[PDB]
Structure formats: structure tokens, C-alpha cells
Amino acid sequence: RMAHEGALTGVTTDQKEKQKPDIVLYPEPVRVLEGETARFRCRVTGYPQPKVNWYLNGQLIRKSKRFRVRYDGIHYLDIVDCKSYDTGEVKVTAENPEGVIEHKVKLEIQQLEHHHHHH
């Protein structure tokens, strides 16, 4: 009968609406020929600025300022350093005090730029 019985926890703590975790990536494999710049997006969502990391070609931690990267939920993979001719695998994981996620995708980089042709 008495709605009041305990202190009400503030909401302005950081967010207003609590959503369920869920990372965003490229489930669709992508292939590019050497000499072409590749663009992929890797962000997280459902939870405020979590602590996630990723693996390029299966390698954790990518160079800073050289490539657009910010460890705060935002990670873009831009390869134009001219070294692309190498097929590998990308795997992204995420951490959260209340959740953990994982997704595997395959990226293979061929070579050249011109497609085959015939009669």
C-alpha cells in the first residue's frame, strides 16, 4: 500500500535506457585484390562504452595514428599501407561486467586488380 519503502536509485548515472549487449561486425566474408584499400567497421552496442578488443588477420592490437582506431568501443580497419596481398582471418570479441560476446569472420586478400577476360 506504501510505494515508498526504500531510496530510489538515480537514473542520470550515465544512461536512461538499459539495453542488452550485442556487437556489430561483418558476418559476410569480403575479398579484395592487392592495390585496393579495404574498409570495414567494428563497433559494439547495447551497453555504454564497454572494453572490447579485436584480431586482424588473427593478430590482436593494431597500430594507432597510422590507422583509424580508438579503444573505447570504436575500431575501424583501414588497410592502404599497400601491404594487403595476404589472406588471413579476423575475429572480434567483447567484454562487459554483465556480458561477453564473440563472432568469427573470414577476410582473404588476393592480388592485382584486373579481372580475367576472354573472347
Swiss-Prot record:
Q: Which body tissues produce this protein?
A: Isoforms 3, 7 and 8 are expressed in cardiac muscle. Isoform 4 is expressed in vertebrate skeletal muscle. Isoform 6 is expressed in skeletal muscle (at protein level).
Compartments in which it is found: Cytoplasm; Nucleus
Q: Which domain of life is it from?
A: Eukaryota
Q: Which residues form the Ig-like domain?
A: 21-108
Processing after translation: Autophosphorylated.
Domain remarks in the Swiss-Prot or TrEMBL record: ZIS1 and ZIS5 regions contain multiple SPXR consensus sites for ERK- and CDK-like protein kinases as well as multiple SP motifs. ZIS1 could adopt a closed conformation which would block the TCAP-binding site. The PEVK region may serve as an entropic spring of a chain of structural folds and may also be an interaction site to other myofilament proteins to form interfilament connectivity in the sarcomere.
Subunit annotation:
Interacts with MYOM1, MYOM2, tropomyosin and myosin. Interacts with actin, primarily via the PEVK domains and with MYPN. Interacts with FHL2, NEB, CRYAB, LMNA/lamin-A and LMNB/lamin-B. Interacts with TCAP/telethonin and/or ANK1 isoform Mu17/ank1.5, via the first two N-terminal immunoglobulin domains. Interacts with TRIM63 and TRIM55, through several domains including immunoglobulin domains 141 and 142. Interacts with ANKRD1, ANKRD2 and ANKRD23, via the region between immunoglobulin domains 77 and 78 and interacts with CAPN3, via immunoglobulin domain 79.
| Membership in a protein family | Belongs to the protein kinase superfamily. CAMK Ser/Thr protein kinase family.
Remarks, anything else?
In some isoforms, after the PEVK repeat region there is a long PEVK duplicated region. On account of this region, it has been very difficult to sequence the whole protein. The length of this region (ranging from 183 to 2174 residues), may be a key elastic element of titin.
Summarizing the function annotation, the protein's role is: Key component in the assembly and functioning of vertebrate striated muscles. By providing connections at the level of individual microfilaments, it contributes to the fine balance of forces between the two halves of the sarcomere. The size and extensibility of the cross-links are the main determinants of sarcomere extensibility properties of muscle. In non-muscle cells, seems to play a role in chromosome condensation and chromosome segregation during mitosis. Might link the lamina network to chromatin or nuclear actin, or both during interphase.
Disease as annotated in the protein's UniProt record: Myopathy, myofibrillar, 9, with early respiratory failure: An autosomal dominant myopathy characterized by adulthood onset of weakness in proximal, distal, axial and respiratory muscles. Pelvic girdle weakness, foot drop and neck weakness are the main symptoms at onset, but ultimately the weakness usually involves the proximal compartment of both upper and lower limbs. Additional features include variable degrees of Achilles tendon contractures, spinal rigidity and muscle hypertrophy. Respiratory involvement often leads to requirement for non-invasive ventilation support. Cardiomyopathy, familial hypertrophic, 9: A hereditary heart disorder characterized by ventricular hypertrophy, which is usually asymmetric and often involves the interventricular septum. The symptoms include dyspnea, syncope, collapse, palpitations, and chest pain. They can be readily provoked by exercise. The disorder has inter- and intrafamilial variability ranging from benign to malignant forms with high risk of cardiac failure and sudden cardiac death.
Q: What is this protein called?
A: Titin
Organism of origin? Homo sapiens (Human)
Residue window of the full protein shown: 1821 to 1931 of 34350
